[PDB]
Amino acid sequence: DVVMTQTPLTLSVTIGQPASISCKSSQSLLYSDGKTYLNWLLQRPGQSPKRLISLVSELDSGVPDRFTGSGSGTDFTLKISRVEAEDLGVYYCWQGTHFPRTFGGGTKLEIKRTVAAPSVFIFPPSDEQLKSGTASVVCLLNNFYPREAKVQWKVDNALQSGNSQESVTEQDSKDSTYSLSSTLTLSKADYEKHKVYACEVTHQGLSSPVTKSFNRGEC
Amino acid sequence: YLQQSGAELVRSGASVKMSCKASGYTFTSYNMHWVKQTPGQGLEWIGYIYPGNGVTNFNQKFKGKATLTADTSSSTAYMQISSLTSEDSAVYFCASAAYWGQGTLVTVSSASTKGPSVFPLAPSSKSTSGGTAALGCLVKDYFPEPVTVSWNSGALTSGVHTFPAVLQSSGLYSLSSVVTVPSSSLGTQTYICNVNHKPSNTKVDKKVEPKSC
Amino acid sequence: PPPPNANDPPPPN
């Protein structure tokens, strides 16, 4: 098979920076009709791929002219003259000249931006869920950068371990931030043993840790 | 564009059939490709059919496993994969001309489907920041992925974060979907999360009401 | 917008 070698694996760039991605094929991609079937795709986080370029250099309709494709034979390059926030995601090359059709391994483009503190929210468990015998408490950190954030649960000022799960969003295509949820789950009997439920957030954009808390039954 | 059929739960050893409906370009003029995406997000070509004459070509890895057809009267392409194993759980895409489908997630598992319970994440003084309020829905205890979440039947999209699901220690999935809105109008606006889980044929709408605390 | 370029050549028959 014809191997597509794509570098770098990751591009971490600032808004306005040029970027370049290389794709090298293990054999020539020149077909017998004289055309070279080399395509570039972008798969933004969460989405299906979208073709940007075909026949090495030909932009698809609606692709901005900040993108250019060049190359011949075995060495190909996709360039972005000035990176914009919506350019993040994973770029792939793929060749259509040989069988099997093959793809490069992908280049992840991530955006570096200024530090932004999270907004922090907490949610008590619903009455409907409590009636069913479980209490889920959710702490939400919205629209922050960088991605690293420390979220601690404290129940009556005791640090918790072992009963929470986190999930982080993909980087945002407009403001290049992340959001994070932390969910503490207890049985209803355990939830009712304690009064104060708090989540404490440490992040580079915060001058000191932020705590959101409630008293069981106040809500 | 290319519109793929919904997610599928299929037993080990059984087969799956998925579809790709084409519009906005000449279906019979371009090869229709099918592509598997691995968990590490590699892309692996399965094969194509050229709808103009029916010819197919396959990756040798899938020959004898994949069948590709094309209905030119309805501009719809189909892929069947037989003898499924754990390594066939993946998102499958169709692709043709400049377009890619949205993907069909196939989960190979002998476990029963389970639809989600949906609980409000109610806005309150404890979910206010800078004059904005956050609210959401907690979508708990379903199998397999995916659930889809919209707000106000798709009319509400700005400010929404639907988180990647987590795998709970039960083997069931959970996710939350949250939105930030003005705190000033929680008494006049309505926020309903719409949760759909195709494998269990589950559809739930939940109006998220504020708490008074 | 003219028709999109092919990703790859169609087969003969």
| A11 and A26 fall within a common domain | yes
Chain B residue with the nearest C-alpha to that of A58: B98
- How far is residue A32 from each of residues A29, B33, B128, measured CA to CA in Å? 10, 21, 64
The β-bridge relationship of strands B132-142 and B117-121 is: antiparallel
Amino acid at residue number B124: S
- How far is residue A147 from each of residues A49, A62, A205, B161, measured CA to CA in Å? 24, 31, 11, 15
Query: Whole-angstrom Cα distance, residue A99 to residue C4?
Result: 22
CATH of B117-208, one of 1.10.3470.10, 2.60.40.10, 3.30.1330.60, 3.90.1150.110: 2.60.40.10
Burial class (CB in 10 A: 0-12, 13-18, 19+), B159: middle
Given A49, A81, A112, the domain boundary residue is A112
Domains B2-108 and B117-208 in one fold: yes
Give the 3-state secondary structure of residue B166: strand
Given A49, A84, A112, the domain boundary residue is A112
Strand positions, DSSP E, chain B: 2-4, 8-10, 16-22, 32-37, 43-49, 56-58, 66-71, 76-81, 90-96, 99-100, 104-108, 117-121, 128-129, 132-142, 148-151, 160-162, 166-167, 173-182, 192-197, 202-207
Amino acid at residue number B151: W
Interface of B with A in 52-91 (CB under 8 A): 57-60
Please tell us whether the domain made up of B2-108 is placed in CATH 2.60.40.10.
yes
DSSP per residue, B1-42:
-EEE---EEE-TT--EEEEEEE-SS-GGGS-EEEEEE-TT--
Experimental technique, in short, is X-ray
Amino acid at residue number B147: V
Chain A to chain C, count of Cβ pairs less than 8 Å apart? 27
Q: Can you list the pairs that B11-14 forms with residues at least 24 positions away whose Cβ atoms lie under 8 Å?
A: B11/B84, B11/B108, B11/B109, B11/B110, B12/B84, B12/B85, B12/B86, B12/B108, B12/B109, B12/B110, B13/B83, B13/B84, B14/B84
Query: Whole-angstrom Cα distance, residue A88 to residue A43?
Result: 9
Query: Whole-angstrom Cα distance, residue B144 to residue B6?
Result: 13
**Look-up: residue for tokens 């590709």?**
B68
Phi then psi dihedrals of residue A191, to 5 deg: -55, -40
**Look-up: residue for tokens 């959001």?**
A179
Count of structural domains, chain A: 2
Range of the domain at A66: 4-112
Amino acid at residue number A15: I
| A103 and A123 fall within a common domain | no
The β-bridge relationship of strands A107-112 and A10-14 is: parallel
Q: Which of B32, B22, B29 is nearest to B1 (CA)?
A: B22
Apex CA A75: angle with CA A70 and CA A80, to 5°?
Answer: 40
Phi then psi dihedrals of residue A85, to 5 deg: -60, -35
Q: What is the resolution of this structure in A?
A: 1.5
Given A63, A86, A112, the domain boundary residue is A112
Q: Dihedral through CA B11, CA B17, CA B22, CA B27, nearest 10?
A: 140
Neighbours of chain C (3+ CB pairs under 8 A): A, B
| A18 and A64 fall within a common domain | yes
Cβ contact (<8 Å) for A39 and C1? no
Phi then psi dihedrals of residue B116, to 5 deg: -80, 150
Chain A residue with the nearest C-alpha to that of B126: A122
Give the 3-state secondary structure of residue A218: coil
Interface of B with C (CB under 8 A): 25-26, 29-31, 33, 48, 50, 52-55, 57, 95-98
Of B29, B31, B55, the CB nearest to C13: B55
Distance from CA of A42 to the nearest CA of C (A): 15
| A56 and A17 fall within a common domain | yes
Chain B to chain C, count of Cβ pairs less than 8 Å apart? 33
Chain A residue with the nearest C-alpha to that of B102: A48
In chain B, residues with a C-beta closer than 8 Å to the C-beta of C13 are 53-55
Residue A56 · residue A69 · CB < 8 Å: yes
- How far is residue B106 from each of residues A47, A197, B18, B116, measured CA to CA in Å? 16, 39, 9, 18
Residue B46 · residue B143 · CB < 8 Å: no
In chain A, residues with a C-beta closer than 8 Å to the C-beta of C3 are none
- How far is residue B99 from each of residues A34, A130, B23, B83, B193, measured CA to CA in Å? 24, 46, 10, 29, 30
- How far is residue B119 from each of residues A154, A218, B60, B122, B213, measured CA to CA in Å? 23, 19, 47, 9, 18
Of A47, A49, A165, the CB nearest to B166: A165
Give the 3-state secondary structure of residue A36: strand
CATH, residue A210: 2.60.40.10
| A106 and A17 fall within a common domain | yes
Q: Which of B118, B70, B69, B62 is nearest to B90 (CA)?
A: B62
Residue A43 · residue A50 · CB < 8 Å: yes
The β-bridge relationship of strands B160-162 and B173-182 is: antiparallel
Phi then psi dihedrals of residue A66, to 5 deg: -70, -15
Map out the domains of chain B as residue ranges: 2-108, 117-208
Query: Whole-angstrom Cα distance, residue C8 to residue A55?
Result: 9
